[PDB]
Amino acid sequence: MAQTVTGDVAQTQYGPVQVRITVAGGKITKAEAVQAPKGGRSDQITSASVPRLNQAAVAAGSAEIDAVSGATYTSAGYKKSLQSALDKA
């Protein structure tokens, strides 16, 4: 069974983060931020951080992933949204 699930939007101090994943036989095979902080240096931080989070979500198969340093708000919002996705099953 393969399925795509979108997690709840996490409000952060720098704006919304929202993660979507494909799970296939349970494991994460695709990860993306549907929403991420934008505007000003938040673009730089988003650019920096979310591709790394995405990669770490696909490698982890779980929301037990490490916060990106210097992007702790975005990372915390990413994991909450990703955990939300996993919980939807």
Author numbering: 1 to 89
From the manuscript:
The second domain of SaFMN3 (SaFMN3-D2, residues 157–244) and the first domain of CbFMN4 (CbFMN4-D1, residues 26–109) could be overexpressed as soluble proteins. The SaFMN3-D2 (9.4 kDa) structural organization consists of three β-strands forming an anti-parallel sheet (residues 2–6, 18–24 and 27–35), followed by two α-helices (residues 41–60 and 72–87) connected by a loop. The FMN-binding site is located between the N-terminal parts of the first helix and second helix. Most prominent is the hydrophobic stacking interaction of Tyr14 on the si-face of the isoalloxazine and Ile45 on its re-face. Furthermore, hydrogen bonds are located between the O2 of FMN and the backbone amides of Tyr73 and Thr74, the N3 with the Thr74-Oγ1, and the N5 with the Oγ of Ser42. The phosphate group of the FMN is clearly covalently attached to the Oγ1 of Thr72, which is located at the start of the last α-helix. The structure of SaFMN3-D2 shows that FMN closely interacts with the side chains of Tyr14, Ile45, and Tyr73. Especially the benzylic moiety of the isoalloxazine is sandwiched between Ile45 and Tyr14, which may lead to quenching of fluorescence. The highest fluorescence quantum yield among all mutants was 0.07 for SaFMN3-D2-Tyr14Ala/Tyr73Ala and SaFMN3-D2-Tyr14Ala/Tyr73Ala/Ile45Ala. These data suggest that the Tyr14 and Tyr73 side chains have a fluorescence quenching effect on the bound FMN. When inspecting the crystal structure of the SaFMN3-D2, no clear binding pocket next to the isoalloxazine moiety can be identified that could bind an organic substrate.
Herein, we describe the biochemical and structural characterization of two multi-FMN-containing covalent flavoproteins, SaFMN3 from Streptomyces azureus and CbFMN4 from Clostridiaceae bacterium. Based on their primary structure, these proteins were predicted to contain three and four covalently tethered FMN cofactors, respectively. Recently, Méheust et al. discovered by sequence analysis a multitude of sequences of extracytosolic proteins predicted to contain multiple covalently bound FMN molecules. Such multi-FMN binding proteins are thought to play a role in extracellular long-distance electron transfer paths similar to multi-heme proteins. The crystal structures were elucidated, which confirmed that the flavin cofactor is covalently attached to a threonine.
